[PDB]
Amino acid sequence: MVTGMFSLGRTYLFRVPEGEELLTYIKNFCKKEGIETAIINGIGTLKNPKIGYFLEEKKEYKVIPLKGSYELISLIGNVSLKDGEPFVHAHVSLGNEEGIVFGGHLVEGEVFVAEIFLQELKGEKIERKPTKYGLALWEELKL
Template sequence: MFKPGPIYLFRVPEDEELISYLTRFAKEKNIKTGVVNAIGALKKCTLGFYDQQKQVYEYIKIEEEVELTNLSGNISIKEGEPFVHVHAVVGKRDGSTYSGHLVEAKVFVAEVLIMELAGGAELVRQKHGGLWLWR
């Protein structure tokens, strides 16, 4: 069981790469386990879809402005370092959406909430599927 720790509410600067920024933030604040939520807008992004049969990610590159309608995920420890694992739903100008594992994203604006959890959830590589999941 984890207990709630500090809550961080902040904005990510324009043109930052979102995953790198969140990872740096987690390292600076020494966050070992946490819950991540965000909304905003992105200049471009790459999403991943995990093919369960082939056990590999397929990538969706989006090279246009999109709304970040929802980002949710977690921070855990992977090989001794904070690891940000988030999924996103992004909306295009025509109202269509894409969703999946957020691989990278160039920020236009992003408002982020991180709730730290006391303790440390460690990720281990699973034999079945090769994914990194909580121990």
């Protein structure tokens, strides 16, 4: 049965090297550390970030490729098992040179500076599996 309750595992705060692709780095970090489930938050600046808006009727993301440096105002997301490997899902809000904000699901983004907080969670299974929506999701917590 899903309870949604976990214990607090390992805790991290780090700067991602310039030039990494953020999602890739966080995945590789978790592989190295043996992290399966976590929550993430962070800030910094990304270059040429690609964001996504899900199109429910098409069962895929509309990908919007931005150009140049954007302030990474928020990154919020999670790490969870998908097809046997840690999988990173995050959304971002990005600031342009006039302070206007774009955002959505993070598809990819090259790091200029990224200061990430990562909190591992330990407990029951919480795995992304295919759904009718065309999204890979966890089993819901039904009250």
